[PDB]
């Protein structure tokens, strides 16, 4: 807004290049980056080992502006759901704590174009791609809130997943540098095994991803055959299951963050994809792809075309897969979470 460079938009190299233009040596960029990501600092004044002159330069041409929280919802089990303001739009960020880990689910887009029939985001349609600052800024903001204070169980973020609003492979230009910052020693310093990109299967973009970065891959499959997938996840019409699975294999040739084993996501949809015959078909489909299968007890929202699969159907589905020796997990569901308002506020201030 002020015509200043948001430093959260910049990877290590771009940061160094920017600092070079300020007439500063590359080490000063690394130093500021460290303050930004190791101490979640967005205030140049708090950077005590930087001299006043450099501080003055930075305040004039740059800022550290992460997206703000407009709604926080805290659950019993420790799960936090944030609504995040991105310009004039809203995205979602979710913190999920566990005993041995803490996972952040980060949005890649404002809305989505993929039209997955089980997805409430798909209802909105695609608005825009998120900028680097608005992706990495979700991690930054969450880490600040989780760190600031200070509750039992909620350890610092250990894992980040590109899983939320939007298809990450349709925003490669912003998703890739964001992940680079997550991975970087001077950024969040996360292992590549703990940075996971989840995709529904944009094949040429996946081929592209593997040439750009080494990060863990997860796939949103959600169906055992092409006729069912064409219906539930329309992008399958462009790139079918076999085209998707071959692209996964090509990615694993360039990348070893997965250690050969991709996580496969599968929402359970009442009488759509949750039958024993579907499970047997899934096992056959996945016989040549090393995997862990996450069966997801999906909950309907108002207007959803599908119902929840019963627990006994999910159980029988799980057992079929286990009989073939697949590592399969029924994912423990986490959390239980006006138009005239602006004019009303104006009419109130009048009194
Ligand atoms: S890719 Fe993800 S966000 Fe996009 S419509 Fe499908 S499930 Fe929804």
Resolution (A): 2.2
Distance 215 CA to ligand 1 centre (A): 20
78 contacts 153 by C-beta, under 8 angstroms: yes
Residues 6+ apart with CB under 8 A from 217: 196, 197, 198, 199, 206, 248, 251, 252, 255, 257, 258, 262, 263
Residue with the two structure tokens 């997550």: 182
Structure tokens at 138: 């979700």
- The residue whose CB lies within 8 Å of the most ligand 1 atoms, and thus the one to mutate among 91, 110, 122, 266, is 122
Structure tokens at 92: 């979602």
With CA atoms as reference, report the closest residue to 275 among 233, 241, 307, 320.
320
The response to whether residue 167 sits with its C-beta less than 6 Å from ligand 1 reads: yes
Structure tokens at 348: 């109130």
Q: CATH 1.10.150.530 residue ranges in the chain?
A: 1-65
d(CA 202, CA 217): 13
d(CA 228, CA 233): 8
The response to whether residue 114 sits with its C-beta less than 6 Å from ligand 1 reads: yes
- The residue whose CB lies within 8 Å of the most ligand 1 atoms, and thus the one to mutate among 167, 229, 267, is 167
346 contacts 312 by C-beta, under 8 angstroms: no
> Residue 124 burial by CB count (10 A; 0-12/13-18/19+): exposed, middle or buried?
middle
Distance 38 CA to ligand 1 centre (A): 32
d(CA 342, CA 264): 44
The response to whether residue 121 sits with its C-beta less than 6 Å from ligand 1 reads: yes
Residues 6+ apart with CB under 8 A from 301: 120
Does the CA dihedral 124-303-106-114 come out positive or negative? negative
Whats the size of the chain, residue-wise? 351
Tell me: is residue 10 an annotated ligand-binding position. no
The count of other CB atoms within 10 Å of the CB of residue 287 is: 9
328 contacts 321 by C-beta, under 8 angstroms: yes
d(CA 203, CA 238): 9
Q: What is the CATH number of domain 66-351?
A: 3.20.20.70
Tell me how many helices (H) and strands (E) the chain has.
11, 14
71 is a catalytic site residue: no
Distance 45 CA to ligand 1 centre (A): 41
Distance 270 CA to ligand 1 centre (A): 19
Helix (H, G, I), strand (E, B) or coil at 42: coil
26 contacts 34 by C-beta, under 8 angstroms: no
d(CA 93, CA 178): 15
Distance 85 CA to ligand 1 centre (A): 20
Helix (H, G, I), strand (E, B) or coil at 165: coil
- The residue whose CB lies within 8 Å of the most ligand 1 atoms, and thus the one to mutate among 116, 220, 239, is 116
Domain 1-65, what architecture? Orthogonal Bundle (1.10)
Please state, in angstroms and as integers, the Cα–Cα distance from residue 278 to each residue in 7, 144, 245, following that order. Answer: 48, 44, 18
Number of the ligand 1 atom closest to the C-alpha atom of 114: 5
| Secondary structure letter of residue 166 according to DSSP | S
Residues 6+ apart with CB under 8 A from 246: none
The response to whether residue 166 sits with its C-beta less than 6 Å from ligand 1 reads: yes
Helix (H, G, I), strand (E, B) or coil at 100: coil
| Secondary structure letter of residue 350 according to DSSP | T
H or E stretch at 20: helix 12-21
Please state, in angstroms and as integers, the Cα–Cα distance from residue 55 to each residue in 12, 35, 38, 226, following that order. Answer: 19, 13, 18, 57
Among 24, 63, 71, 92, the active-site one is 92
Q: CATH 3.20.20.70 residue ranges in the chain?
A: 66-351
CA 149 to chain centre: 23
Tell me: is residue 291 an annotated ligand-binding position. no
Q: What is the 3-state secondary structure (H, E, C) of 255-304?
A: CCCCCCCEEEEEEEECCCCCCHHHHHHHHHHCCCCCEEEEEEECCCCCCC
Alpha carbon nearest to ligand 1 atom 6, residue = 116
H or E stretch at 103: strand 102-106
With CA atoms as reference, report the closest residue to 222 among 159, 190, 266.
266
> Residue 188 burial by CB count (10 A; 0-12/13-18/19+): exposed, middle or buried?
buried
> Which alpha helices (H) appear in 151-224, and where do they start and end?
172-183, 203-212
Phi-psi region of 225 (alpha: psi -120 to 50; beta: other; left: phi over 0): beta
Q: Experimental method used, please?
A: X-ray
């Amino acid at each position: 807004k002020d015509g200043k460079i948001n430093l959260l938009d910049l990877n290590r190299q771009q940061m160094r290049e920017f600092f070079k233009d300020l007439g500063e040596k590359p080490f000063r960029a690394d130093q500021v980056m460290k303050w930004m990501y190791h101490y979640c600092c967005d205030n140049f004044d708090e950077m005590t080992d930087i001299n006043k002159v450099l501080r003055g330069k930075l305040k004039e041409v740059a800022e550290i502006r992460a997206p703000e929280v407009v709604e926080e919802q805290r659950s019993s089990d420790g799960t936090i759901k944030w609504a995040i303001a991105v310009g004039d739009q809203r995205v979602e960020t979710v913190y999920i704590p566990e005993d041995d880990r803490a996972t952040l689910c980060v949005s890649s887009q404002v809305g989505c174009a993929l039209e997955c029939k089980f997805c409430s985001t798909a209802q909105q349609g695609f608005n825009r791609n998120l900028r680097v600052s608005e992706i990495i800024g979700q991690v930054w903001r969450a880490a600040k809130i989780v760190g600031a204070a200070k509750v039992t169980g909620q350890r610092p973020i250990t894992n980040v997943v590109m899983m939320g609003m939007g298809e990450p492979l349709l925003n490669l230009n912003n998703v890739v540098p964001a992940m680079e910052i997550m991975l970087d020693d001077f950024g969040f310093g996360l292992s590549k095994r703990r940075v996971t990109l989840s995709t529904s299967g944009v094949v040429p973009a996946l081929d592209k991803l593997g040439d750009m970065i080494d990060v863990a891959l997860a796939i949103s499959l959600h169906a055992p055959n092409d006729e069912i997938r064409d219906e539930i996840v329309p992008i399958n019409k462009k790139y079918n299951i076999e085209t998707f699975l071959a692209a996964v294999r090509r990615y694993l040739e360039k990348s070893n963050a997965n250690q050969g084993r991709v996580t496969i996501e599968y929402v359970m949809l009442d009488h759509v994809n949750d039958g024993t015959e579907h499970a047997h078909q899934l096992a056959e489909l996945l016989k040549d792809t090393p995997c862990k299968i996450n069966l997801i007890p999906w909950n309907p929202f108002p207007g959803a075309p599908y119902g929840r699969s019963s627990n006994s159907r999910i159980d029988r589905f799980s057992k079929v897969l286990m009989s073939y020796g697949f590592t399969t997990i029924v994912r423990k569901t986490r959390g239980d979470d006006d138009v005239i308002d602006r004019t009303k506020r104006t009419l109130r201030k009048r009194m």
